Every structure is written in C-alpha cells, then in structure tokens.
Design a protein around this nucleic acid. Structure first.
Ligand SMILES: C[C@@H]1C[C@@H]([C@H](O)CC2CC(=O)NC(=O)C2)C(=O)[C@@H](C)C1
Lengths: 52, 179, 187, 160
RNA sequence: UCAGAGAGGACGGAAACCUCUCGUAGAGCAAAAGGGCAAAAGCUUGCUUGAUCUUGACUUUCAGUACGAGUACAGACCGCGAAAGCGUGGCCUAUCGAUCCUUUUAAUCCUGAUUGUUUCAGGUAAGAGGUGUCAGAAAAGUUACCACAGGGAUAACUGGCUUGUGGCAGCCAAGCGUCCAUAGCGACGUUGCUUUUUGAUCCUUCGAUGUCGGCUCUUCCUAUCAUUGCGAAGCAGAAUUCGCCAAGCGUUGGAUUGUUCACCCACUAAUAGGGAACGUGAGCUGGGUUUAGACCGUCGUGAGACAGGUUAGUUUUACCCUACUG
RNA sequence: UCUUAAGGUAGCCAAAUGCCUCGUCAUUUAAUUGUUGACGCGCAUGAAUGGAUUAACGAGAUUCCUACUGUCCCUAACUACUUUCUAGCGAAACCACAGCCAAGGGAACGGGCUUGGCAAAAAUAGCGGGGAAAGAAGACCCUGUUGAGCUUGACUCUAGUUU
RNA sequence: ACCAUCUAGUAGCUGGUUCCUUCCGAAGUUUCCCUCAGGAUAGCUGGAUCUCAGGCAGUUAUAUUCGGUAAAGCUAAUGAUUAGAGGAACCUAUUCUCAAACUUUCAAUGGAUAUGAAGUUGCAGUUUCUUUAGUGAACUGUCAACGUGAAUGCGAGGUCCAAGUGGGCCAUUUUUGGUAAGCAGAACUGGCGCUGUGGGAUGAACCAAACGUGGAGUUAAGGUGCCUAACUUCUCGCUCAUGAGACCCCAUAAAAGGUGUUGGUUGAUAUUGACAGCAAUCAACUAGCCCUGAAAAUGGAUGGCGCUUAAGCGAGAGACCUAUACUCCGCCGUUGCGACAAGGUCGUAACGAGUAGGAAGGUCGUGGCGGUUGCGUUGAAGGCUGAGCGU
RNA sequence: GUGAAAUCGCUGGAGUGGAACCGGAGACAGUUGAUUACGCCGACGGCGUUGGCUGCUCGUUCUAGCCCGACAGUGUUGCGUCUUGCUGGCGGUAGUGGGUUCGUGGCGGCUAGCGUACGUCGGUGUGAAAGUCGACGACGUUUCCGACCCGUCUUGAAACACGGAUUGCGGAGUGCUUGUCUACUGCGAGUCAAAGGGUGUUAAAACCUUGCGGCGAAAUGAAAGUAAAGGUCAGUCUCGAAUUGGCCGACGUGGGAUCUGUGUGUGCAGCGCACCACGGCCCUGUGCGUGU
RNA sequence: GCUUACGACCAUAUCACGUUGAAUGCACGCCAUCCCGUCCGAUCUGGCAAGUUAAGCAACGUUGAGUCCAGUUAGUACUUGGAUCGGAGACGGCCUGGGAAUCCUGGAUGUUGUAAGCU
C-alpha cells in the first residue's frame, strides 16, 4: 500500500484559477530595512524643515 | 500534408527575392514554375523550394509576382516528359515518366494520379524536377509510343452500359457487343 | 459553446433594506425615487447607506460633528449622516449644528438644541435639499470595532499585531511559548 | 528527494566563464548604485559573501537600500498564485546595472526634448509613440543586370 | 609561489640535500562531491582573541511558522596594519534540538500579601543538561486455543497484461557427415511463434468463486506416435530417417509413490503432446496439504517456531430457472 | 597443531529423529520412492531432557504369505421400503428484475450492452453444466495507535516473605 | 460460566442519512504530526457584501537580460578507445569510435524586468548623515512649467465567515527503474473523475463538439450496396489470394524469399541484322499490389450480409446525409442595465454542463401555539378514482 | 367505527415466437368541450423574417485560339532541297474570338418554416339528444427511434463487488453550556440588570423597583509599580539629553465618495467622511546612556 | 612621433626568434658609514652618478603559434505548433514558424583617460 505519490499536476491550474496576483505599487514607499544611520539623519532633516 | 487536390492542377509562374539588406543592397531575383491547386499553395511551394535551394526563407524574402499560365493551344495533342524525384517507404528515387495530353498542367495532374496509383506515393513525397514536350521519336515508353501510329484502329470490346434515370428492373436484354 | 466564465456574473447587492422597519423601508423608497429621478450621486449614496447593514454604520461623535462644522465654510452647511449621533463627554463647547440623521441620542440632541442647533429627519432633508446642496456627509469610524481588532494576519505569524481569542487576561493565558524569547521563540 | 542545501545544482550557474577567472576588475566597485535603480543579479562565484540565492540569479530587481559595500533589492518571486516582492541584501560583485530602464529614460528624455523644441519653434506636436512595424509599402524592382534565374528542384544523388 | 619537468653538483643510487631555467595552477586549502582562489583563499612568519556584548531587518526550509545556518547593516569595546581597510569563527554549500524540570551567570533587581532583619524559596534575562522515530510518548515476546472493526487500498488458488525463464519454428553458413555446408545436422550470430513451466504485476474477488491428486464423462486443438494418400534420403530389404495433405480413428495392463511428474515390467499398429476456471468435490474419494490431540530432530531462557519427518482427525442443501435426457 | 567447562562414552540409526535422498548393498516382485537386514563423519542419534532390548497385551502405525471373496475384469438378477400415481394433509431455504447461445468490448470470464446465430402454448419424470447457486459482515493474509489466553532477561506495581 | 448494572462503553472503520426548482461550483497537491484508511495547515470553492470608476492581462511588440538541454566538439582541457605514419619504449603530427555524474561553443521552446502624472524639468528650504568643500544623498514645499508616450482586450480593488477535498486515473511529447507489463516513478498541457451529445459496430479517456425547452436552415468528425439517412454517381490506374483486402487510438507480426504482375534505375548487345531452333534482347538492382514465411484448443467474426473494370488498394471530382455544434425564430428562467408612484410590473442584451459542496426562492408539504378567515349530520377528517392547474 | 397497500378469485375486453417494464412521435379505442358577428379548426392569396434550389445578362483580372509572316521539325495524303497535311516556339492582331476571375453589379423562375401591413372562403357551435366539429388520449393496444438495476465505496459498476422477495407504519445533524462571525431590534459612554422586594386573582403571566453586580469606558509589566497633548510662532541661554511665553489644540503629507467656488459631458481650485499608504509624537517594559 | 606616474577595458594587449632606439625618461649600474633586512647588500633598505643601451622596456619584422573578427559550413543539424500524415515498428517526410556549431577560407595584432615631460 504505497502512499508517497507526490506530483505537481493540477497546481498551475489552481494557481491561475484566480489569476496570479502581482505585487502592489506602494511597496517601494516604505523605508523598512533601510540603514539606521540614514533613517536617523532623515528623521532629523524632516523634523527641522520649516513649513513656510 | 501537401495534397494535389482539384482536377487539372493549375500552373503558376512565381517570381520572388530576398529582402534587400545593407550588406546586400541588390538581391538576385528567382523564378519558378509551380503546379498547384491555387496561388496560395503556389506561393507556399515556391518558398519551400527556394528555401531548399538558397539561404532564404519566407520571413526574409518577398514575392515580386504570382501569375497563372494558360496553355497556349489546347487544341493540339503533345507528348510530355516529366522528371521527378520521390521518396518511397525505404529510399529516394528519380523517375522519368511520359504522358500524352493537350496541356502541361493536365500532364502533371496525370503524373500525380499515376504515381498515387502505381507507387502509393502522395503529393508531399514527390518533387517535379522538370516537365517538357518530347518529340514522337524521342519518346521511350511503350504505352505512349504505341499511340504514334497514323493507322491506329481499335474497337470497344465489352461495353457495359449503365442505365441512368430508369427503374432498376427491366425486361430488355443487355447487349455488351456493338459491331 | 462560448468560452466565458460565469463565476463573477452575479454581484451580491442590497436592493432594499433587510430590516422590516416600516419607516426605514419608506425612507428607502423615497430616496430610491429621488436617486432615480434627480440622478444625483448624493441621493445614490444616501440610498446605499439607508440599505446598508448596521455594521457599516458605526456611531458618530458630537465631537466629530462639531469639528466638521467649525471648518472654514462649513458653518452653515447641513451635516448629513446615517450613523447614530452620540454625545461626547470630553467635548466642552458645542457649536451651532444643523444635522439630518436617522437617530440622535438624548444627550447629543439636548446639547445640539441648547447650543442653538437644529435636528431634522431624512425626509425633511429631502424637502430641504432634494439634490443634497450645502451638505456635509459624515459617518462613524467603520474599522473601530473589537471584532475588527481580531481581523488580519494570524497572531502567531511574524510582524502581526492581531488580537487573539483568549478566555481571559493574565500571565497564565497565552503568554509563554511563541511570545517571548525565554520560551522557544518570539514572533 | 533532493537535498535542500543553499548551493545545490549551481555547479555551472555559480562557475566563472572560461578564461575569465581570477581578479575582479574594479569598475564593478566604481559603478554607482542609487536607491530606486534597477539592477540585474548574476552571482559571482569568486565572492562567497553576500551571495544571492540561486532562485534570484538572472532576475532584475529594484534597489531600496545602499550600504557600505552591498545593496538591498526588491525582487519578484513566484510562489503558487502570488508574486512576492522579496528583499535581499546582495553585495556589489553580484550586481550589474540594468539597461532596459536607462533606455526607457533616454527615450523619455528625447520625447521631452523634441516636444519642447517643437513647441518653442511653433511646429505641431510631433508623434511620440512607438508603432509596430507596418506592412511593407508599394515599390518597383528592376531586372536590369538582375535577370531572374529559373530554379528547379535537384535530383537525388547517392552521397556515399 | 605551488604540482611537475629539464639540466648540473663528494659519498648520493630511481629515490636525502644544494643550484639554475621552464612551469595557468596540471598543487594546496581538516573532511565527501562540486564551485572558488596565484604579490591568494595556498606556504613561511609577527602580533592577536571579532569564536566578545546588544537589538532589530532579511535569505534559505516555508504555511512565507519554528529551530538550525547564513547575509547586510546599526550601537559598544577591541585585534592586526603605516594606512586605506579587514574581522561577529572556519573560502562557500552539511556538521544538529521545543514545552516542563534541574543547574549556572546576571541586578548593590522584584515577591513571600500581620510589621521588619537574615537564611530559604519563588520570579524577570542569557546559557547548559535531550529527545538521532532528529517539530521532540516512558515500553519485550508468543498464539496452531484465539477474538473484533474493516480491507480486494494488501498477499496465498483461478482469471487479466508481460514472457525474463519454460516449450516450439525460422534465416547466413564455419564445420560434422570416407570426398560433399544443406541427405540429416548445423557453431559464432540472428529473426519469430506459444502460454501445458516458473516468474513479474496487483486489474477483479476477503458481508468467501470450496484450495492437490486420482476416478468417471464429454468435447476441442494440434507443433502427427499409429493408420490412409504421397514426396526425399548417406532409400538394394524386417527395419529406419526427413518432409507434405492430414486430427477421421486409436493411443493400453501393472509394481513403488498422496503425488502431477519419475522409473521399471509387459503387451501393442501406437503406447504423441495439450485445452476446456492448472475441465470436472450440491459428481465421488480424502491419500496429501490445511485448525484444534500427540511424538521426534533443530531452534528458543520460556510461551512457542519450523515448503523438516510422523500418527488420528464431521466433505452440508436442488423441490427453483436454464441446459441436457427422455 | 589450534582449542573447550567438557569436547558425544557404552550403545543405536537413513529410525515417528538424515536435508542431500527415491543414500549404497542384499531381501521381497515380472516390475517397488514401499518392507526387512546391513553400512554410517549421524544437515540435526545418544544414555532417568533416560540409552539398548524385551515375553505377554493393543478397536494403535506398517510389510508380506495363506484362505476368502463382485474391490476389480464387467456387469447381471432378485427381495423390502422409497421415489412413482391416487385420497387426505402440507412446510422451508432462496428471491434487484429475470432466465437460449458465439464473438466483441467492458471492473480484464455477460442473462441484459454491440454485431451475429435464432426465436411458438401448457406441462410430467430425471439431471447435476451454469446461475462466478445457498448456507456465514473470510476462522488464511494485511491494516487498526482494537482485544484477549500464555511466557519472560520488557516497563510500572503488588500479596507474601526475610531483615 | 451465567444475570443485572456501569452502558446509548469507545471506534481514525463498515452501512444508512427522508421535498422541488434556481445560481455558483471543486480536490486528490504543499508543510507538520508514532503520520501512511486519520488530522491540522496552505491551496482550490460558496456566501455576505463594501470602497471606488484605468490599471490590469496564462496574448503580442520594443528594449535589456538569465540559462548550458538539443545540436556541435574531442585534429581544445578530463576520462575512455582502434590503427598505423615520421623521428621496444618515448616524442611529433595524425587517425577510428564514445561521456547521466566531459566540454571551448551553443539553439528552439522558456524565465524575468521596464515601457510616464506615484512622470520630466527647473527653484528653495531642512539634516546631528557624507564630503576639504553645495560636495553629495535623501527629504520637504498648499513651489512653477510641461500633460498620458507600444498593440489588443477589459471596469477594478478590499475585508470577513465557512464547506468539501487532502486513494486519483488516462493521453501527445520528454523521461527514470524494469526483459517487459492494461507495471512502478516524474515534467508541461489537455482530459475522465464531475459529462451528457454526433462518429469510431461495442468502450471513462479516441475524433468532433460541451447541454434551458421547441422549430427552420447549415455544418464538424464520420459517412453515402443493404442493414442505415445519404450515389450501385464521375475520372485514372493496381490487385486474383484452394476463405485477398477493407480506414487514428485498435485490438500482433519480423528476418528472409517468388522467373506472379506493374512501374522505374543502371550497364551491355543489337539492324557492319541482338537471345532460342536445328526485332528487340541480356544482366544486376529497385518498390507498388499479390503469394510463402504465418501453428490452439465451444462455432464466429473488415460489425454482419456480402463485394472481384469492387461494395478492395492509391490519387482525385461533383452532389448528398447527419449533432444537445453554428445562424435565425418563439417561449422559460438567471445575470447586467434601465423605465415606471413598487416586497411590484415592464423593457432590453447576453447567457443556461455538473459530482463533493455552498447559497437563494418555494401562494411545495406536515404538526402545534398567539391571532385572524371560513366550512360542516343538506355530510368533516380518512379512503378509492375522472376534468384540470403547476417546470 | 373507518377499512388503505402488498397478495388473491371472478366476469368482460385486448395482447401473447427465449423476459417484462420505460422515454420520444403518431394511429386506434376511449374521454371530454362547442356563443351578420364571435368561438374551435382547415384551404388559398398578401405582407414581415430566416431561408433552400435554379437560371440569364453586363462588366472586371490573367490569357489565348481562329487569322497573317519567316524559320525548324515530321505519327503525313497525292505523285523526295516535291507537294499536301500536321506540329513547335518566334513575330504580328486588323477582324473574329472563347477560357479563367470575381463584382459595395442588373434581371428573373420554383419553393419551405415561423409570425400575422391583412384579405378571400369553407366546415362546425347557440333548447335537447343524435350526428358533426375541436382537443386530449393519461400505467389500454399497435407501430418507428432510443432504452443494461437501483443505492453505495471506488480511478473505474450493468457487473462474475456488497444491500435490496413484496406492502403498510416507525426511522437518523438534536438539546444545552461556552465562543466567534454574520443579519435584525432597542438604547448608546453607556447598556443589561441577578438574586430579591412591591404589586398582580383571566396570580407561574404582566407592571414597578438596584450607592452596589457583569461587560465596556486604559494599557503595560513576572512583580514592586507606573499609566497615554501636542502643533506652531516668538524669546533667554551655561548652546545643551536646556528652559520661558503667547495662540491653536486631538498631529503632518498623498489619495479620497460627497460638498463649495469657478471655467468649458469634461477642466481647475478649496474644505475634506470612511478607508488606505507613508511618517510624527504620547503611555508601559527593557538595553545603552547621561546629567539638572 | 615618443618617455614616465597612476589607471580603465583585461591576449587585436599573450608567446617565440630577430632589427632598431634620436631627446627626456625608465632601466641596468657604483658604493654599504648611516636607517633597514638577510646564511649571503642576491632580494629589501640607504648614499650616489663612473659606465651601458648588453638586457628590461618601446617600435618594427615573421606566407610565425595563440587570441579576435568575418565568410563558409547552411537555410544544413536541431527545434515550437498541426495532421483520422506514411510505416509492423524503429523512424521518415510534409504544413507552420525559429535556426546553430566544427573542419576549411580571409582579414586584424591593442584602444584609451588624468598628470608631468621630450621631440
Ligand atoms: C533537558 C533534558 C530533558 C529533561 C526532562 O526529562 C524533560 C521533560 C519534558 C517534559 O515535558 N516532561 C517530562 O516529564 C520530561 C531531563 O531531565 C533530561 C533528560 C535532560
């Protein structure tokens, strides 16, 4: 009663059933994982710029 | 695959050439005589043969002209010689065949039918190298030669005639001999 | 045979309030007529919010109403909301507010009327501004629900701040393994 | 089943090109990378540090971080029915500027310059759209010194 | 600058050490394989402890969980270097571990709730003690005295596909055949056929298709033992061999063995080979196999095991439909 | 010469114990994988886990001679009671629907399906080819984190007993 | 042992699981589990909807890239491996044949990214980061100008709740184990499972084509001598078989042979008369049909009957037949949109497969309760059964 | 009391060749309807729509042949560089002139289904009844086509896989506790109120009644404990991990249905809900780290 | 037309043999007290300027090897998609599109930036 039976038969069809979802367009706006020193300097710069 | 469909294949003259490029601003013009059912097939076979013979394919070339050729005088009988190359189930062979007809296109159609009948060869496995008109004394096939006689005579021995628009049954006697 | 997909042919929608309230149904009728005839997206919005479920109409705060009215140019416009207008104890000064709403709580109504304001119904709003002229459309915060706190990525996945479903709160209720590095890991 | 090591099946992928081994030329380090730029990933086997994973080899990504000698890149990866924008910190040696985006930028620059010049000179706004190559137009071909050659199929010859 | 090669030098030789040329890596880099590396990642050597403290982000497996491993930074304190720089272990790809509990280190820390002091105990943070079935129960057999829920997801008998093996038939001729490859054979090779061998598979059947052999009785096929009609011989004839048309008709009595097979005795025209659910158990028998009793040998501490031997061990139902006989 | 605690002694044997095996020789027969008597490097005989014998006894296993016979060549005849027919009485098993075949394909052995062969009431007595006929949720095999009897060097306990 | 109770003991296992229509509609795959007949997990699916009104796409174009398979190479490295040649080994230049764990080189299919408003130019501020340095980097501003920059198609996005599934099987191509297998294991895609319909005599998968209920017309695959709707229709050849042949998967056939017949290739002789006997011939080949090779058991299969200038084989031509397919016409319903002062009516365009499963409608049906509307000894319920109504 | 189905007997009709049942389409038997205009049916015309078959006639594309001239050949009549024939390209085309191709062409002929720009007319029906006409024809009979037994596990069932002889009646996702989401209702920074008490005689109901209780309004830490207001402008300064004062007060930016203003379906500008994205601050724990 | 320092691309630049080399320069070169390092002033390090283009280096030469580019190989090999295509099969061709690489042939033999200098 062998029961390993791996396959990839219908998986592409299942994936395309609902369409392949491309990544959003705001992912490039976040500064997550950016250099800590650069982020610190950016925070200081943003804190001080005079609005008018 | 390619098939010689249609009674009395048409004959076309096709002229084409490779599309000029910077390195080859002027290209040679090629011309062929092709027997095909219609001009689309004519162009297809033209490109087939031209791609076989010269380094050019349909993508890189163009068809300057495609024209149909009509028999000059279909009121006279000629002997036609056909040089062809064909592939059997085992090997490739060259054949020379002879036909009698009032049109070269008719002779080529006869050639296709005869090859199909005698060698079970289809149109896709046959290349027509050459077609010409042979004189009476330059023929070399007995079937054609036996008809080069001004005194030719023969009856119609056993004529089975088919009734067309009548009942299947009749009281008439059927006669196959007509002296 | 035609090669098309029918999975999304039908779109779920509310063509009338699920509520059996006769007055709500009458308001829906009136504003369906108004939207169909005047052809105003304002009336369409009012109709849709009338037919919405109560989950989508979170209560609105008198503080928000006052903030909307105090903005430059909004002093005389009528605030229209299909959300209940509640009273805000943290609000000390209430300006003059003209509001059309389904329901206004006792304290909010008392404060609005005392401050010289006016409260009308949706049919009175229809008579006043049939096309929604001089209006300020407002609603309560839709995502501010304890239920919404539990929605999102599962609590046990990285960078997730979803609230778990816990029997109680304390050191003994899902605070040991997978929540601190001293126990296996932390996410 | 296969082992799931990091460099399984990279025998030829991470190898150097023939007669191309050795010291790494310094334009690789002199090249300028800025956040928002597009870069192609091609692993350099000679640098075992900061290597990209085999699944990102030959893929193009966008830089989001610039460190001392590496860059953070956002590369699209297919996982079932979603495309994930994975973030990878790759060293400079495995990175090469992408030319598609710079070509597009050049085209946009040319479009703007042509539009500005035409507007200033009073000309009509010119066409600034790429068009698919249209079918060939009408022309004439001359046979002078180029007479057509009659071609026929050749007979079969036994080539021993 | 390696592996190695060439050419020289007391004892010194094929091989000790010294010298000069050439030497794209043909060496070495802890280990398996594969990548990588030449003023190095290799060899020699100096100094050192970045194999240290701290938090996040990310890659790999992936559910985009955890562990493990790794990547690029940020803060501290350091090492080497003249310096730029490099360094969080090993040139890269494997070399490893949750909860609970114990134990250790850390704060001049928190708690023991009648007030305090000191022991003691318990906590917060980071390690170690181990789960190798490695996302991690604490675990020896036998049953033929056996039982239950199921399984044709799964074996033993038939049937189905396959035909390695078994059997049978062809093609070229090196040779045998006193001489002569083909009368009759035919090696080295090679082409097929068959399912009366045994295998391979696991498609049907485990709310059961009664599982060996013999007896009895039909019919069928031939790859023809005999007989009929013929052709060819290394055919002068009892005799014998090959081949063709040919399954019309025959192919027996016995000793031993449960035997199918096997072997022998005798007669005979001949003592041909096979199928029909390895034909045939509501046709028989029950000798064997194949429950429970019992004995021996070997094995086991033992219960017990043994296609090892031996003895004894219940064979049910047709009156229904069809077929067949009248 | 290696080597054990000791290295199977007296006996006995192809045995109810020997695989190879239908062991080899003789005896019995026309013919014997059988019987008996011998041989013994005995896969794996053996001395109260008793060895070797043994008169008498045995519904115990085995071989042979004689007598006897229908076991057989090869069947036949007869008797009683059935079956048979009649009067009276009168069930049960089983039953998806039903019941002629060949081949095909199909869950790889059809009563139904496809193509053919065919196809004429209602019945009596037999029959055992088929209905993969009926009896029973396979007593064989496997699975189950299902049992039970028994054993012990399994884990954890315990009556009792000694101190 | 038996009796009662704990006890309706537990079962990842077997069996059953009861009305109608409408709409949508799967999976046998990933990871973890003393896990492999089971679960959890992601995937596939339904429903509720909500926010909006151009950015997307199982498709191309342009631009740029990745790869080391087919092919190619070993007279290029490594590993095999035949033979000599020029100076027994050795050297040189060669040579025959090879590589899943060789390669200089290297496709086709294939993968990825980009193709403007979230953009391009400037001006004018911030920074403790960076630089010798306005030197850069980044950001900020209700800054100023410019205005949609390939094709085709098309409305897009978000959240929540939850089912079933987690035995698969078949086929073209590629491919590993095996002698092979209707065997075992994989890759892409399409199917059956879940699915009917025309054709292949018959068949889960083959060819055509997918389905409301009807009609007319036309077809796909397949066919037209009779079964059987459609021609013994038209043209040219080949074939005689003492059971020929007859249509994808498909239902077996080979090596080797024929002086059967039909075409071709090559080489010779021949009219200074070619072969046989006292006017073409000879020889070797070649490939169509036919024949031998070709033996199995109940009587049997181009599906059957039969068919021989065919009703066979090959090339073709007209016409004709036939689907739940295509066009048009009516009706039913769903969906989208819309009109109307209505929990409704109507209009309009497209659409209608379905197992497991999910929703909706039900003036479908049954028994009560609070109310409401009525009928009944001039006959209620119950029972048997004609005229109608509703899919 | 009623008196079903299965099963069974009789009378009459009808079928009856190794199953029977069943779907589609007719016919028969049978059942049922039927007030000049109108109903129920038919025929012939017209019109609309979708067609099917079949002819002429213009032209268009590419092309000849007949006809004429020279040359070359010969399957050649009649009597040899003869002649008559015939063929081949080549050159001409006046005249004549067919093939092939189709046209945003022109003109016809026959005929079908569906519907009714609508006409011309026949059958029948107006007291029964009989007849006639119309419609059905349902588990009756007969024909042509199709047609394997359901439920179930299964990759696969008509299966030589299991359950099922027949009929009636009964027969299986429930109750409750606890969660979560969703829909509806009331109130809303509150809401619900418990046990209980007061009342209530169509008194287990209904009605009234809560310093206090549940949930919510504040989190965080193991705990001791601590516990959520800043924006902008302008100052002093020991120029720093300082301080002071006003105004505003729930932060900033981008996108935002709607609204407002203004141009020309569309554009620009302003205030911006919910929501989304990117940040900023504040509370608590902890590491580093200072001081005033 | 050149030399040097620092480079970029990393053989069209490499390798073999040979000719030439004006000026700067580079280089060889002399010495070893001192700094510095060795068994050894060979290397490294320091102080110099008698001598040489001998070598390095640069330019040039070779029917030079290598490398690079192009042609040919060739519309060939291979390959996407199609067929109720041929064949017992192995396989083969046709339709529709992509499309190589050896042998062989021919050509090229570094380009160039910053700074300083010679002519
Ligand atoms: C660290 C390792 C494990 C530890 C201990 O046995 C593990 C526990 C785990 C658990 O949850 N329950 C238990 O009863 C055992 C121990 O003493 C040694 C073997 C060492």
């Amino acid at each position: 009663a062998k029961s390993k039976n791996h396959t990839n038969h219908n998986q592409n069809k299942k994936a395309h059933r609902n369409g392949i979802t491309k990544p959003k367009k705001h992912i490039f706006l976040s500064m997550k994982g950016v250099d800590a020193k650069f982020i610190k300097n950016l925070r200081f710069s943003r804190k001080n710029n005079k609005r008018q | 695959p390619t098939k010689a469909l249609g009674e009395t294949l048409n004959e076309y003259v096709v002229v084409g050439r490779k599309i000029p490029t910077e390195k080859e601003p002027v290209t040679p013009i090629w011309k062929m005589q092709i027997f095909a059912t219609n001009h689309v097939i004519a162009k297809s076979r033209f490109w087939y043969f031209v791609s076989m013979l010269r380094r050019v394919k349909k993508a890189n070339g163009e068809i300057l002209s495609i024209k149909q050729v009509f028999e000059k005088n279909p009121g006279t009988v000629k002997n036609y010689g056909v040089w062809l190359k064909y592939d059997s189930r085992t090997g490739h062979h060259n054949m020379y065949r002879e036909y009698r007809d009032t049109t070269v296109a008719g002779a080529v159609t006869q050639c296709y039918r005869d090859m199909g009948a005698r060698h079970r060869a289809q149109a896709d496995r046959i290349h027509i190298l050459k077609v010409q008109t042979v004189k009476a004394e330059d023929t070399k096939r007995a079937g054609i030669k036996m008809f080069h006689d001004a005194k030719i005579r023969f009856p119609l021995p056993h004529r089975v005639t088919k009734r067309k628009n009548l009942s299947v049954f009749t009281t008439a006697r059927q006669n196959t001999h007509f002296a | 045979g035609i090669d098309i997909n029918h999975k999304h042919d039908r779109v779920a929608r509310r063509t009338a309030p699920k509520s059996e309230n006769p007055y709500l149904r009458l308001l829906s009728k009136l504003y369906a007529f108004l939207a169909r005839r005047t052809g105003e997206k304002f009336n369409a919005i009012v109709l849709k919010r009338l037919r919405m479920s109560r989950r989508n109409r979170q209560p609105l705060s008198l503080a928000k109403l006052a903030r909307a009215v105090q903005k430059a140019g909004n002093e005389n416009k009528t605030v229209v909301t299909l959300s209940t207008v509640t009273d805000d104890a943290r609000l000390y000064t209430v300006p003059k507010i003209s509001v059309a709403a389904l329901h206004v709580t006792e304290g909010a109504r008392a404060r609005i009327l005392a401050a010289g304001g006016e409260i009308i119904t949706l049919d009175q709003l229809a008579l006043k501004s049939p096309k929604g002229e001089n209006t300020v459309f407002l609603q309560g915060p839709r995502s501010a629900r304890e239920a919404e706190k539990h929605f999102g990525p599962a609590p046990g996945v990285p960078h997730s701040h979803t609230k778990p479903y816990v029997r109680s709160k304390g050191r003994k209720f899902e605070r040991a393994r997978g929540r601190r590095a001293s126990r296996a890991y932390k996410n | 089943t296969n082992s799931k090591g990091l460099r399984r099946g990279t025998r030829y992928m991470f190898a150097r090109d023939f007669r191309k081994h050795g010291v790494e030329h310094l334009s690789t380090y002199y090249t300028q990378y800025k956040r928002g730029d597009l870069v192609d990933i091609k692993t350099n086997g000679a640098f075992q540090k900061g290597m990209p994973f085999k699944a990102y080899h030959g893929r193009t990504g966008r830089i989001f971080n610039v460190t001392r000698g590496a860059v953070g890149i956002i590369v699209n990866k297919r996982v079932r029915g979603n495309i994930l924008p994975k973030r990878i910190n790759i060293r400079i040696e495995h990175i090469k500027p992408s030319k598609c985006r710079t070509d597009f930028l050049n085209r946009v620059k040319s479009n703007d310059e042509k539009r500005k010049a035409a507007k200033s000179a009073g000309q009509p706004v010119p066409a600034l759209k790429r068009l698919p190559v249209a079918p060939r137009g009408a022309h004439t071909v001359t046979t002078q010194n180029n007479e057509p050659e009659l071609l026929a199929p050749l007979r079969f010859e036994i080539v021993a």
